[PDB]
Amino acid sequence: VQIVYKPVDLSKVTSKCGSLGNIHHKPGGGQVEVKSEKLDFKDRVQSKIGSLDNITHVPGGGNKKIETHKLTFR
Amino acid sequence: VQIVYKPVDLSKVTSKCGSLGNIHHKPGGGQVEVKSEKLDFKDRVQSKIGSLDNITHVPGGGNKKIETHKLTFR
Amino acid sequence: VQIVYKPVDLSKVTSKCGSLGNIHHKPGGGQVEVKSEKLDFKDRVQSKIGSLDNITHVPGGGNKKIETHKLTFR
Amino acid sequence: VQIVYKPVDLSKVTSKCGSLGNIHHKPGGGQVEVKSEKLDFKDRVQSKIGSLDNITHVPGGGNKKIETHKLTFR
Amino acid sequence: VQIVYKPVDLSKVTSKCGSLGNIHHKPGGGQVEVKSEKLDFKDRVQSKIGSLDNITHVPGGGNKKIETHKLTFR
Amino acid sequence: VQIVYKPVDLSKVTSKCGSLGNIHHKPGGGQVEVKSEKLDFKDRVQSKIGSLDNITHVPGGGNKKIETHKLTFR
Amino acid sequence: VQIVYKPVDLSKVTSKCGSLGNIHHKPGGGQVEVKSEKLDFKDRVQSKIGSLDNITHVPGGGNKKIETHKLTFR
Amino acid sequence: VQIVYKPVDLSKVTSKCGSLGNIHHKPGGGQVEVKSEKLDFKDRVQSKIGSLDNITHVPGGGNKKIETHKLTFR
Amino acid sequence: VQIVYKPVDLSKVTSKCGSLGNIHHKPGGGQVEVKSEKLDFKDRVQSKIGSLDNITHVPGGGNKKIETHKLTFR
Amino acid sequence: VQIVYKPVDLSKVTSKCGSLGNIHHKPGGGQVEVKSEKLDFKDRVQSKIGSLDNITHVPGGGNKKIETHKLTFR
């Protein structure tokens, strides 16, 4: 029983951008009304209730590598 | 019983952009009204209830590699 | 019993863009009204209830490679 | 019993675009009214209920390769 | 019992576009009214109920390769 | 020269209504596009140019008497 | 030369309404686009140019008497 | 030369309303775009240019009498 | 030359309303864009340019009498 | 030359209202953008340029009498 785990990974992620100019985020907010009474969350819940919200994201490169290696022997 | 796991991966993701000009995000917000009473979430729930929301995303390159390697021996 | 897993992968994703000009996202928001009483979510639910929402996405290259390698021995 | 998994993959995805000009997304929002009482979601549900929503996507290249390699030995 | 899996794949997807001019997406929204009471979704449901929605997509190249390789030995 | 102006006017306008029930005015608006260059209005002009508009009028009685008495001696 | 101006006016306007119930005015607005360059208005002009507008009028009685008495001696 | 101006005016305007119930004015606003360059108004001009606007009027009685008496001796 | 101006005016305006209930004015605002360069107003001009505006008027009785008496001797 | 100006005016304006209940004015504001360069106003101009504005008026009786008496001897 011989298991050889040898992932040869050569990877490059490259973003080339000269200049990012005028980014204008001007939002006139509104109205959010939320009515509830009983909220039950047990395990690993991500919940946003009644949000007015503004996200301006300007990453120079925004590159993301996700690598998962799982080996299980039963 | 011999298992040879040898994924030779050579990968390149390349975005070339000179300049990003005028990005204008001006939204006049409105009205969101949500009525509930009983909310039950058990396991691994992602829930957005009653949101007014504004996302401006300007990544220079926006490149994303997702690589999953799973080996299971039963 | 010999299993040789050798995926030779040479892949390139290339986006070349000189300049991105005027992107104008101006939306006049409206009205969203949602009435419920009892919401039950058990496992791995993604749910958006009562959203008014504005997404401006301007990636320089927007390239995404998804690679899944699964080997199972029973 | 010999299994040789050797996918030689040479692939290139190439988008060449000089300039992207005026993109104008101005939508006058309307009205969405949704009435329900009892919602039950068990496993792996993606549900959007009562949304008014605006998506402006201008990727420089928008190239996406999806590669799935599955080998199962029973 | 010898299985030789050797797909030699040489593939190129190429979009050449000089300039993309005026894209104008101005839609006057209307009215959507949806009435239900009991909704039951068990496994792997994708459901949109009561949406008014606006999608402007202008990818520079919009090229997508989908490759699935499945080998099963019983 | 004798002018006797004696209009004996006895007038009654009567509207009897018990109850006015559900009046529902929900119109999905559309699009109006009007192009002109030179507009000249001299005396007593009433002009509506490029209107999208919604009028809900529910008067309890809506009674209107118009009485004009003109006597001219030359 | 004798002018007797004696208009005996007895007038009653009567609206009787018990109750006015549900009046619902929910209009999804649209888009109005008006292009002009030169507008000249001299005397007593009433002009609405490029309006999106919503009027909900619920008068209890809405009764209007207009009475004009003009006597001119030349 | 004898002018007798004796308008005997007995007038009553009467609105009787028990109760005014639910008046709901919820309008999702839209978009108004107006382009002009040169506007010239000399005498007694009433002009609305580029308005998005919402008027909710609920007078208990809304009764209006307009009476004009003009006598001119030349 | 005898001018007798004796307008005997007996007038009553009466609004009787028991109770005014739920008046709900919730408007999701939109977007108004107005472009001009040169505006010339000489005498007695009433002008609204580029307004987004919300008027909720609930007078208990809303009764208005307008009476003009003009006598001119030349 | 005898001018007798004797307007006998007996007038009553009466609004009777028991109670005014829930008046709810919740407006989600939007966006107003106005561009001009040269504005010339000479005599008696009333002008509103670029306003977003909210007026809630709840007078108990809202009764207004306007009476103008003009006598001119040339």
Residue numbers in the entry:
A (entry chain H), B (entry chain D), C (entry chain B), D (entry chain F), E (entry chain J), F (entry chain I), ...: 306 to 379
Study authors write:
As a negative control, we also collected and processed images of AD tau fibrils before incubation with EGCG. Reassuringly, our control map precisely matches previously published tau PHF maps. Three new densities alongside the PHF (Sites 1-3) were revealed in cryoEM maps of PHFs incubated with EGCG for 1- and 3-h. Moreover, the density attributed to tau exhibits the same backbone path at all time points. Our estimates are based on free energies calculated using coordinates of the control and 3-h structures. The results show that each tau molecule in the fibril is less stable after 3-h EGCG incubation (−28.1 kcal/mol/chain) compared to the no-EGCG structure (−34.9 kcal/mol/chain). In fact, we were able to determine the less disturbed control and 1-h samples to 3.4 and 3.3 Å resolutions.
Alzheimer’s disease (AD) is the consequence of neuronal death and brain atrophy associated with the aggregation of protein tau into fibrils. The small molecule EGCG, abundant in green tea, has long been known to disaggregate tau and other amyloid fibrils, but EGCG has poor drug-like properties, failing to fully penetrate the brain. Helical reconstructions of all three datasets revealed the Paired Helical Filament (PHF) tau polymorph, while Straight Filaments, a polymorph of tau fibrils usually found in AD at low abundance, were not present in sufficient quantities for structure determination.
